[PDB]
Design a protein around this ligand. Sequence first.
Ligand SMILES: Nc1ncnc2c1ncn2[C@@H]1O[C@H](COP(=O)(O)OP(=O)(O)O)[C@@H](O)[C@H]1O
Ligand SMILES: Nc1ncnc2c1ncn2[C@@H]1O[C@H](COP(=O)(O)OP(=O)(O)O)[C@@H](O)[C@H]1O
Ligand SMILES: Nc1ncnc2c1ncn2[C@@H]1O[C@H](COP(=O)(O)OP(=O)(O)O)[C@@H](O)[C@H]1O
Ligand SMILES: Nc1ncnc2c1ncn2[C@@H]1O[C@H](COP(=O)(O)OP(=O)(O)O)[C@@H](O)[C@H]1O
Ligand SMILES: [Mg+2]
Ligand SMILES: [Mg+2]
Ligand SMILES: [Mg+2]
Ligand SMILES: [Mg+2]
Lengths: 436, 426, 48, 441, 426
Amino acid sequence: TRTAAHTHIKGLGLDESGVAKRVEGGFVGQIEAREACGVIVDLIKAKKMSGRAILLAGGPSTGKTALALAISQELGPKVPFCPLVGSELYSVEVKKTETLMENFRRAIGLRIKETKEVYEGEVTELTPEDAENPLGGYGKTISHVIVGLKSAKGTKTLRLDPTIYESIQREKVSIGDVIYIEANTGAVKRVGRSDAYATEFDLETEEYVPLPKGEVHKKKEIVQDVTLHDLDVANARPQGGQDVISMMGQLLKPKKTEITEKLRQEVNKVVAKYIDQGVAELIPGVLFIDEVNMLDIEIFTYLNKALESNIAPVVVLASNRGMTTVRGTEDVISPHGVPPDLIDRLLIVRTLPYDKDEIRTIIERRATVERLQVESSALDLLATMGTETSLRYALQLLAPCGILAQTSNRKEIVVNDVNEAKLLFLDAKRSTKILE
Amino acid sequence: VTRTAAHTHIKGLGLDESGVAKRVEGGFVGQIEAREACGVIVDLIKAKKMSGRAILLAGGPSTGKTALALAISQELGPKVPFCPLVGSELYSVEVKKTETLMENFRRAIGLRIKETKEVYEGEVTELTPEDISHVIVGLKSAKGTKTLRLDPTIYESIQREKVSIGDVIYIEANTGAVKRVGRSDAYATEFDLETEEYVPLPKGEVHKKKEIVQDVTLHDLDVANARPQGGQDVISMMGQLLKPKKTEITEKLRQEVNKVVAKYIDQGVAELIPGVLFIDEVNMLDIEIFTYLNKALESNIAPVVVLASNRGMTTVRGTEDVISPHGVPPDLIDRLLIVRTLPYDKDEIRTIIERRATVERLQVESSALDLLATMGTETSLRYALQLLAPCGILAQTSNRKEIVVNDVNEAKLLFLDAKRSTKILE
Amino acid sequence: ASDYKDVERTLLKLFKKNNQVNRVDLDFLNLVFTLNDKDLTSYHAEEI
Amino acid sequence: SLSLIAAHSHITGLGLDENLQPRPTSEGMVGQLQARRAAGVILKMVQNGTIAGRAVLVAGPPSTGKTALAMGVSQSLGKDVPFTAIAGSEIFSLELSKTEALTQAFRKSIGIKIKEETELIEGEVVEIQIDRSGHKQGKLTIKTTDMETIYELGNKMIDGLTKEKVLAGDVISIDKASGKITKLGRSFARSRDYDAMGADTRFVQCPEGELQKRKTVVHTVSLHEIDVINSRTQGFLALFTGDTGEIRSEVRDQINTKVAEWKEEGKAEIVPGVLFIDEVHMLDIECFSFINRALEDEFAPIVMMATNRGVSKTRGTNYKSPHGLPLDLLDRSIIITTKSYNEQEIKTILSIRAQEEEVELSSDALDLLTKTGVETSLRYSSNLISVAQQIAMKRKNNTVEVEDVKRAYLLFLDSARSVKYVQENESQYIDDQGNVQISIA
Amino acid sequence: SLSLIAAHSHITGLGLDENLQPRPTSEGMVGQLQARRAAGVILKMVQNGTIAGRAVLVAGPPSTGKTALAMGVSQSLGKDVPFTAIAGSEIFSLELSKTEALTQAFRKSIGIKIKEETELIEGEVVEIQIDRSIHKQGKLTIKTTDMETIYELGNKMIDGLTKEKVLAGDVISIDKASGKITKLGRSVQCPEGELQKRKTVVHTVSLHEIDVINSRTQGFLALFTGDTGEIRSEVRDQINTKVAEWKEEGKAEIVPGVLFIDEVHMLDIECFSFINRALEDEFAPIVMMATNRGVSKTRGTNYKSPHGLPLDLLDRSIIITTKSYNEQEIKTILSIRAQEEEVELSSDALDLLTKTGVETSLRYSSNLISVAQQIAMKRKNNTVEVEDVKRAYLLFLDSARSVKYVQENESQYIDDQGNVQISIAK
Ligand SMILES: Nc1ncnc2c1ncn2[C@@H]1O[C@H](COP(=O)(O)OP(=O)(O)O)[C@@H](O)[C@H]1O
Ligand SMILES: Nc1ncnc2c1ncn2[C@@H]1O[C@H](COP(=O)(O)OP(=O)(O)O)[C@@H](O)[C@H]1O
Ligand SMILES: Nc1ncnc2c1ncn2[C@@H]1O[C@H](COP(=O)(O)OP(=O)(O)O)[C@@H](O)[C@H]1O
Ligand SMILES: Nc1ncnc2c1ncn2[C@@H]1O[C@H](COP(=O)(O)OP(=O)(O)O)[C@@H](O)[C@H]1O
Ligand SMILES: [Mg+2]
Ligand SMILES: [Mg+2]
Ligand SMILES: [Mg+2]
Ligand SMILES: [Mg+2]
């Protein structure tokens, strides 16, 4: 399997009482940061508060993205988690404010359940009937239709509306075709021809399908997780309609448009109504904005306003610079590149740099997860190299060492392999020196 | 009778078989070394071997860069594609500058193909539908008669063309196009007063087949494969009125078009005619355009692009601290061969003025021509060149054919130069 | 672009199998309501 | 309304008495007595509906109740009174000009209450008998729960009945003005007749009362909505999509004339509202110059403006301004100032916040939180409250205490301590020049 | 893929042995021993596929084969594996956001192979009976190399064969599942075995292609037109989860590839900010970056940077540095280039070309080779002699000589302030 930068991170590694073990879940060190992340994860799982914001502040290569992905893993696949980077907000189709609003709503999941009844099987009979009296109806005066379906557990004779007969005619269903009728909406689908009649003709283009399993009429309760933005898109760009105008619109590209506040208000009303009935439940997720330094002043101000909404995920921010002028502004030097008013709404989680032992343990774990064996002396050399230039350099240099060792048909990486890798690939400081 | 422009007198390079350039041939005067270099470049292009070669015509203003480009275009001939440009054209608003540049690149590469055209032409005798259903139509021609079965699209075209029985129709099989050429002559006396236009019954057989040769470019194929471009069906109308603006053609479409062209060449039905792309005012190009032009020159299928520039040690547009020999970053400069073009002395200026007067059908007295030449030497050659037409107009107003000194002096007193205007402003 | 039609059909067939099974009809539950303005009347809706 | 615990979920409105006198604590607001009096005056001005085009500026430091005061006004106003809340950065669009965005926002803040009179006949058709040769003639009977009547049908009515394909037992509605026939639904008695039902079928009860009824309905539609509807042929979709474009000015003038005509005839009423612009300093000089005239229209709403910047440089200009706004706009604006809270007010605010979040604070923890708020920030303590609650919950303890607050203070930093650490560790963070020492040893 | 001769056509590989030790001159590549070693290590890492999101920078003087190295890597990687080489000036588009473009670029280099087993009958053809309703009765016979047997058709097969109007005695391919019918020419060719064969066809697509395919009603047109638009992020998430499920099922395999940005010095700080995160995630390809400038101000920033890239990216990348070629390496590279261009240079001519390339630029001499060949062609000579190279040097200029010419006569060129001395006199 592919080995990403944060593959070794398997979890936050916390105890039941909240204490974090020294080495668990792929983490090494960062005790206080891990405890703060555990408190935040508890807050997210509580699912009560809206618009809370925290900021993961620290230098480059400290673990901000590592903590974000660890939080995502710990939350589970039932909690929304929208990763992002600051640069993606600058759209060319709609204002950056609209894109921030869209992404911000994506992290409010809704779990809605619906029970559906479907009639499926193989058609055995189809005997349309007219009204008992010619004066009963208009024109064709077609009454109910009788259809016979066959399943693995038996057969059933159904009495259908003339609208369902019209659907049957539209779908071009003949005797022996496997069909599928939804009593919820009256929609008829033509699955295909039964495998029983597969060899009826020795050359024919027909999608033969097996006989449906189970009963002919099976009732199932369907549960799906849908975002609020999904409902907004469905209202904005519905897929319904079979007119020529509908088809022409379908061929058009799905350009983003500034969905009005009225549509969100109506969506909120209907979702509140359905949650009130108990059918559906709201799940506020988490929105992750990496490289918050790159946001414009307008985006920061809209973030200020978004946090005052009634429905709002917990935005987690990452910044790797201090005392830096805010983009889009000439004079405002700010603590982390974040405007002072937004900083006043944030909670800073300080992350601290590592020592040699932590680097050594991280290199051990990274080599282990890489399916590479490293000698103790070569590992000490790699640790010294990382503490000399950067940890990330060594963490990436593990792979070329492994490749070089394989080219020599050696099971483990030797110090000479590390030296040769050093010769082949330089670092930023060495490149700057050699360019001088 | 005829109109005259800046380069109406430029007919060619005037180079011999050995490649050396005579002092005065093809309307050119002097600049022998540049003409020889341009002839070598013409041979390089005609070889049809290399791709992406680029050269730079470096010199001062009014020195003969555009003249050399147009002479190369004339000498190569109308068969090859020569595309002149200013960099300002690249700054489109519908698509990015890269898309325009790449489109101009593939537009400068020519393709010549052989195609067989199947032609039917008849007067109509029956109209039966096979029942949107196929139609059955009978046709006659001077040599005989035929009945045809046409696809529903052709049926829609015929219905929307207001074809009657007894109308004469033209069907091109390749495109499925139906054109009503008119009403048959046999019904000329059918009425006394109607809006009909009567045409004679077509000669020969109903079905004809001919082989033409048509010239296309890679861009034409790209546009053909990208968007619908013709047709008489409402489906075609809707397809082409949708997505009207230009789009960023992908590299995949270009690769597929290249594969198709390679297949055609291998089958022998097509031949390739590499051409030239000329960009003028290259200093107008931003650093991004030069940066991508670096990539296009390494492309395996590119024309012989020539560059003209006339600025020295000027900063590169877009950049703020890059001082370059001609506004061209050093990355592109290494991809170029620089052809130096030199200013003109007094005698060559006089000869050029004489030839321009001869071309524009003017008669100039020797003393008047000497005065015009010396005043062009004093201020500028182009100033003398544009003064020729007002001088000719002035001479006609005096009921006199040949130009005299008085007309030249009057023209100088009436119209001023840039330097004189700048002095007046001061 | 004709040569890519088989690939397009293959991808659509692969995605339809998962797409059709585990989806909830948002239109059925009145979550989509922008078409309702075309064929319904306010007083008719309130009376119904 | 669909809501989660938010920042301003505890402010039910302005805590004013009958004489617009603020209470020491009421409806979730503490202090800001002068500001609350001004807000009540603004509310009475809005409710009166006679004064047109008034700009109000709310100024003061951040976390001083500007947005809180606006939220209180919004809650006090209630429904039927438009309240458009927009940001300064919302007006910048790639589709609409800034002036067009402001124009659409302004019209959204004015609502039009229009009355429609409808005459209908609704009932379950009992029997239909149609005779056709010449023109056709027929008789029809419609019954309700307490009425039954036989009617004679004209040719066009019969044509409509046939084109609707109405059968017996169906409840239908006919507008005697136009004759349009709508099938409401089917009776319950016919439900058994089928196993699967089409999408069109509906089961409804038989209407009660008299067969012929008169009913009038009042509709609340904003001016922007009317303009969008009356611009194109499908504007009502753009009312949700937002791809409405720049409506023609002649359309807007015609719509103003039409609204005036309706008001003169007495069938339409105007319900003016309040426009709130958050962070007005994010607007440009062109927007302000437009607003100067636009505030002066007869249909201009009452605009409230909230700012936190002091003497700063106006966007789109090369000079500094008292609040970032041009003097011409301030001339037509009255400024409401706010003052920072004292210790007792911060204590009351923290108690209110604890009550709203259903967190059981202790007295000692409340004192510690108030001290931290006065030392560092009120919003910092408000954010720390929930963290302390979670920390206490993890300790299997149902009440918060001093240790939980201390742990929250240690785990989560504030602005001052973050500044202290960033200044102490300048070498490990990227600077303006981009230099950073990633190495540690 | 037929195309003319470019400046990189000779590079047929990276020239590695079994022990990854590069030979002095193989597959077109000369020297650059450490650079080729590092390129081979990267190539093996890509082929292994167990490492994702690695960025490699190529460093050192311009015109030192950084693009030549990347091309060698692409060719040595072979087909059946994505390798996207895009210029940094192609990222900035007026229809696609820079982040969206970078995302598409990353996904385009990740390939997915999905196997589709189709039942198709391939046969030579024998007479076909179609009859009216007695819905329809029809029989066809197919001949192969060892069978001749009758199939009895159904309604849809009869309809398809009527639509195709298949003749007899030719060759036809019919798919049992899809139902597509492919025509083939007359029997040169002949069926080779059983009438109905079971052969799987493998389809190579990228994640971007799948995203576009599911993007719209007919989104597969966008793969060629390029008007995809900003795809919704939920669509990409769906593609990711379905691809993960397919890989778990074993019905599709992933082929990670290489992304090459040739001119990284044009992306702004926002692009670098996105790139920093794009590398970390799974399904991220390996990015190759080339830069020539030592220390410059990054676009979008007001400060210098150690390579034109922010230090955050430099921490995430490994840098491969290239030494400038020596005289011997220049000589042998020119020998390879001349051999590729079909030019027969003399020994003294080769030495002169070597010294000329060493003095000014290798590219300059490489472009001068074709000019010299064309010059010799004017003299009707096969071998290129010294005088041809000297004439090529004289007629076409390098950067330094042109700079000297402009510097000594800066008055006749337009300067940075817009001043020029057009007047030849005074
Ligand atoms: N506490 C930790 N334990 C183990 N490995 C870690 C820890 N923190 C970071 N890492 C590893 O080192 C890398 C640096 O963290 P990262 O979030 O990428 O830094 P940045 O602040 O630049 O985003 C991570 O990708 C991860 O692989
Ligand atoms: N050597 C020449 N012989 C004849 N006419 C010339 C010559 N050079 C320039 N001209 C005339 O004067 C004009 C100016 O030349 P041009 O090519 O525009 O100069 P540049 O392109 O260097 O600015 C040309 O259009 C042409 O009509
Ligand atoms: N008058 C008030 N009454 C109660 N709480 C207030 C008041 N003003 C501010 N707050 C508190 O501060 C926050 C609202 O302040 P806000 O209006 O955003 O400040 P500003 O807008 O002045 O920056 C809420 O958390 C609220 O508890
Ligand atoms: N080691 C080499 N062997 C053969 N040809 C080379 C070598 N290095 C560079 N070249 C050729 O020299 C020219 C310059 O190389 P290029 O990659 O464009 O330089 P850069 O990428 O540094 O600008 C190209 O024509 C290339 O094919
Ligand atoms: Mg990082
Ligand atoms: Mg010119
Ligand atoms: Mg506020
Ligand atoms: Mg290079």
